[PDB]
Amino acid sequence: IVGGYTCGANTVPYQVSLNSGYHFCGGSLINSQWVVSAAHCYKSGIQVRLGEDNINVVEGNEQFISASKSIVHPSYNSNTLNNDIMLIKLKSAASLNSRVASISLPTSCASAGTQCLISGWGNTKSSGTSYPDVLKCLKAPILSDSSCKSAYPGQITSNMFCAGYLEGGKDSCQGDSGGPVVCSGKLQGIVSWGSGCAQKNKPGVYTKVCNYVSWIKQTIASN
Ligand SMILES: NCc1csc2ccccc12
Ligand SMILES: [Ca+2]
């Protein structure tokens, strides 16, 4: 997260870290067994880390649970990033408590102008590199479809939205991938892509979660 703030320990209780020896992506806990992330975060050997603040220090609220199954969306295209979503099942159910909690799925799509919370352990600089140990947060609005399309001609599908600031300075970034965009207590986005981070006229692009709720539910119901 570039241009954000320290969230505070365990204040984003659905935020998980995907770990394969190291943090490499965020995700969102959506029930005791299942995590939402980005399909471009797929790999084998994932351990889900819940209850994290400092991802380098064991602070006392973590739960570490290995994935049993990954399901990338059936229509994910890794060239266009269309349908950039996957589900990860945990080998055992997480213990749910104030610091480890699921985030509700949307029952309707959010509109441009809605305020959201984006979070992660990704890069905090727009030039150069610095990775935080504690969770960072950013409040950002959803941008109109038309400004998203004009920012990224030919590349925004109906499964994507832009959020952030056309002026630059505040955005998600590499290592935030797969993490939440939460708006009024519903998971509306997943950190997906952009051109650089926090550049002028290049806002972040996010998977439009409300298009996937019936796929999510039917997948969970059968797996
Ligand atoms: N908002 C931009 C963004 C999000 S994840 C990622 C990974 C690499 C480069 C940019 C980004
Ligand atoms: Ca920790």
Swiss-Prot record:
Q: What is its EC number?
A: 3.4.21.4
Provide the cofactor list for this protein: Ca(2+)
What is a GO molecular function of this protein? metal ion binding
Q: Which reaction does it catalyse?
A: Preferential cleavage: Arg-|-Xaa, Lys-|-Xaa
Give the GO cellular component terms, alphabetically: extracellular space; serine protease inhibitor complex
Entry's Pfam families?
Trypsin
Give its localization: Secreted, Extracellular space
The cross-references to SUPFAM superfamilies, in alphabetical order and at most eight, read: Trypsin-like serine proteases (SSF50494)
Which GO terms fall under biological process for this protein? digestion; proteolysis
**How does it associate, per the subunit comment?**
Interacts with SERPINA1.
Q: What protein does this entry describe?
A: Serine protease 1
Give the organism, scientific name. Answer: Bos taurus (Bovine)
